[PDB]
């Protein structure tokens, strides 16, 4: 197979991989394409998401024209390091991995016209600024921006191979999302102005929507049951101070525990999430369910219970058996309709 | 490109990277400007902050001066291994890496007069010792020391390229917990045992946001403290109620501190949040000793009682309100 060996020797002979194609002659145009093999999990604490893609780059290098038996040279990824390749980096990438098990996951195909296809398998951790103000009923547009690190807009321009909506493809089976739903993605192009010049930036915004099922099970239901549990004491006779005292005290203790552990899923943001308001209102109900008993006990003249003169049923108790369940139900309708 | 290929070949022909520019002569003036991408996470547990930036360096190497071509040659980042670069390092840095996807994040931009623009995209985890005495109402001052390792001030000079405008992107930073009040650029020489070295310091004065801590620890501390006062409205003969109410609030105050001590390093001094929790625990403990005092009087000293209750129904809410006013005015 020395015929193909001569071609590779001929191509790399007098080849300077330190200069982009058309240096000082034209703008090097790079056509890109992304295939998302798996959209990895989203981390709220680090405000980052993981993506696993086939990052395909296509461009024409006239220094790599050949005539041979085969029109396309499906070469080895070792050949890539001997050829000028674009220095694409991700602007919001935190810590990315270019996999090389068991070999560098790269392909390089040189058609006889000089076109190069250069795809790699990358795992990218990207910064996704999250406005956790409607948490957990919130949605984010996690971006993915990339462009040439060194070459300005006048030297290297990026472009989408197919139509922009069709040049980023998500595999149906690959979705490593636990508590999110990938609604879709919008593909766009922009411009950034740094201290070193203009740079074309290719962006892709993935539109995630958090699934509320987990937080309903683990946070909203315990808060709702605690409010209902605290209102059970409204049906107990006023001459049972120890029993109703334990009812109010334990529920307030329970609410404090829930109010603390509910933040463990989030970064320490300075505002209040939509879940914080629900906990605050539940805290207000449970706290007031004990102040209500602290008022009935204040008017409990006798200590012995019914089986002389006996205590009458509290008028505060009768109203609290209705107003407290009713207001909480009214609050639930307002709270859920506001965010859903 | 045939002419450009010849020109770049001549620059690296006979080029010795073991010797700095003007090796036997005046020090090379290296100008530095930083484009901060983000400040990732400030940790009191590890006493460090993570910083991502577009660190750039500037210097004129006459050996890399090319004429004829009117362009600024941006070369592939693999050429940096064949050029002299300053041995810049970060003194307080713990763990740093230059990103390497899709390639190594470097740029070499030669200019015809001989200037070299050398940019790196670096993520640095730098040490930042903190004074948590006024935590969480504290301002921290985390710096970034930049220094040359091998070359003394006789062989290299560091200056901020552009003066006070040499660091950008600080305004775009939005830390969830802190707030960058300001930043300063300092240029000074540091003397070690092997000579005096140039140093640049970039310092941030982070200010903590109290909003999170109010919803996390301050408010439950207050409500539990308010909760303990409910025993002041219960008949003294209700032993099973007032004791259970009083004891429970005592436990929770200790319990609340558990969910807070684990989030911070084992510092040996008292924080401003510990002062409040110790203050709240005193009231809750005294609100329980108030009942034990009443129960002993009515039973162990029977053979006024309601006076102590009514007196405590005003003094405790008043003293705790006064306690907050003294605490908050001093710390804010």
């Amino acid at each position: 197979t020395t015929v193909f060996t001569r071609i590779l020797d001929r191509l790399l002979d007098g080849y300077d991989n330190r200069l982009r194609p058309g240096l000082g002659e034209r703008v090097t145009e790079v056509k890109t394409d992304i295939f998302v093999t798996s959209f990895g999990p989203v981390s709220d604490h680090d405000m980052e998401y993981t993506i696993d893609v086939f990052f395909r780059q296509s461009w024409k290098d006239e220094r790599l024209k050949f005539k041979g038996p085969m029109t396309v040279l499906r070469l080895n990824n070792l050949m890539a390091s001997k050829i000028w390749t674009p220095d694409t980096f991700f602007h919001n990438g935190k810590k990315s991995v270019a996999h090389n098990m068991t070999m560098p996951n790269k392909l390089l195909r040189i058609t006889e016209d000089g076109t190069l296809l250069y795809t790699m398998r990358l795992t990218v951790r990207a910064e996704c600024p999250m406005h956790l103000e409607d948490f957990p009923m919130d949605a984010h547009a996690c971006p993915l921006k990339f462009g040439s690190y060194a070459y300005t807009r006048a030297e290297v321009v990026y472009e989408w191979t197919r139509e922009p909506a069709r040049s980023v493809v998500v595999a149906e089976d690959g979705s490593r999302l636990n508590q999110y739903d990938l609604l879709g993605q919008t593909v766009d192009s922009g411009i950034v102005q740094s201290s070193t010049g203009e740079y074309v930036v290719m962006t892709t915004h993935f539109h995630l929507k958090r699934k509320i099922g987990y937080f309903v099970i683990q946070t909203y239901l315990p808060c709702i049951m605690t409010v209902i549990l605290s209102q059970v004491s409204f049906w107990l006779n006023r001459e049972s101070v120890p029993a109703r005292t334990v009812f109010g005290v334990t529920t307030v203790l329970t609410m404090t525990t829930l109010s603390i552990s509910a933040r463990n899923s989030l970064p320490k943001v300075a505002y209040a999430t939509a879940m914080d308001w629900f906990i605050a209102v539940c805290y207000a109900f449970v706290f007031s369910a004990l102040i209500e008993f602290a008022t009935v006990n204040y008017f409990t003249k006798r200590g012995y219970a019914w089986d002389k003169t006996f205590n009458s049923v509290s008028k505060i108790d009768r109203l609290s058996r209705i107003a407290f369940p009713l207001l909480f139900g009214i609050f639930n309708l307002v709270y859920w309709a506001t965010y859903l | 490109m045939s002419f450009v290929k010849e020109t770049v070949d001549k620059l690296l022909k006979g080029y010795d990277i073991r010797l700095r520019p003007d090796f036997g002569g005046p020090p090379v003036c290296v100008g530095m400007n930083i484009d901060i991408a983000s400040i990732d996470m400030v940790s009191e547990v590890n006493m460090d902050y993570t910083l991502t930036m577009y660190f750039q360096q500037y210097w004129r190497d006459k050996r890399l001066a090319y004429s004829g071509i009117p362009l600024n040659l941006t070369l592939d980042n693999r050429v940096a291994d064949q050029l002299w670069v300053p041995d810049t390092y970060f003194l307080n840095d713990k763990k740093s890496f230059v990103h390497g996807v899709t390639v190594k994040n470097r740029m070499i931009r030669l200019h015809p007069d001989g200037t070299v623009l050398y940019g790196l995209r670096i993520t640095t985890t730098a040490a930042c010792m903190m004074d948590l005495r006024r935590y969480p109402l504290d301002e921290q001052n985390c710096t970034l020391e930049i220094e040359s390792y091998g070359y003394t001030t006789d062989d290299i000079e560091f200056y901020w390229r552009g003066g006070d405008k040499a660091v950008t992107g600080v305004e775009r930073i939005e830390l969830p917990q802190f707030s960058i009040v300001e930043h300063r650029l300092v240029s000074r020489n540091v003397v070690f045992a092997t000579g005096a070295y140039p140093r640049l310091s970039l310092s941030f004065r982070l200010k903590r946001n109290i909003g999170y801590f109010i919803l996390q620890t301050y408010m439950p501390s207050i409500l539990i403290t308010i909760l303990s006062w409910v025993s002041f409205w219960i008949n003294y003969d209700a032993s099973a109620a007032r004791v259970a109410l009083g004891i429970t609030t005592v436990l929770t105050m200790t319990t609340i501190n558990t969910h807070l001590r684990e989030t911070l390093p084992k510092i040996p001094y008292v924080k401003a949040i510990d002062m409040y929790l110790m203050g709240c625990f005193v009231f809750v403990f005294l609100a329980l000793l108030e009942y034990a005092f009443v129960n002993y009087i009515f039973f162990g000293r029977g053979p006024d009682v309601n006076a102590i209750d009514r007196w405590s129904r005003i003094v405790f809410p008043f003293t705790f309100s006064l306690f907050n006013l003294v605490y908050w005015l001093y710390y804010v």
């Epitope: 406005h131 766009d188 102005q193 930036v201 915004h205 | -």
Partner: nanobody, 123 residues
Framework: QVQLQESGGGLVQKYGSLRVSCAAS????????MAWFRQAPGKEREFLAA???????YYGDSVRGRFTISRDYAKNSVDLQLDGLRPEDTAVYYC?????????????????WGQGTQVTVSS
């Protein structure tokens, strides 16, 4: 209450240049996307420009190379440098700021909107 007050100009000679401005108030939009929209009479809102937190500028096709957007993050404001104006540019220009969900080009993805500075070009 969040306010997006827009200043600039209302009348300009054909061939001139104008610099519309928009100062935010009540909230920092450092992490949001600030954009410019225009609505000619008897027509829908047309996306013009937008700059993200990473200083990345997105321009509409009809205004690419003419209108330049530039934010001042310290002052919490966004400024559009109108250039090469034509009589077809006579419209109400709006200042918008939002997260950018499903959008960055959709008027429905911006939560906070400005008042609307009328701009007129006469030949």
């Amino acid at each position: 209450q969040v306010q997006l007050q827009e200043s600039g100009g209302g009348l300009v000679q054909k061939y001139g240049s104008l610099r519309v401005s928009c100062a935010a108030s009540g909230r920092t939009f450092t992490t949001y996307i600030m954009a410019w929209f225009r609505q000619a009479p008897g027509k829908e809102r047309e996306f013009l420009a937008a700059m993200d937190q990473g200083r990345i500028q997105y321009y509409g096709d009809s205004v690419r190379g003419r209108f330049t957007i530039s934010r001042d993050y310290a002052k919490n404001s966004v400024d559009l440098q109108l250039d090469g104006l034509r009589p077809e540019d006579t419209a109400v220009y709006y200042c918008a700021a939002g997260a950018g969900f499903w959008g960055l080009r959709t008027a429905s993805s911006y939560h906070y909107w400005g008042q609307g500075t009328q701009v007129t070009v006469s030949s």
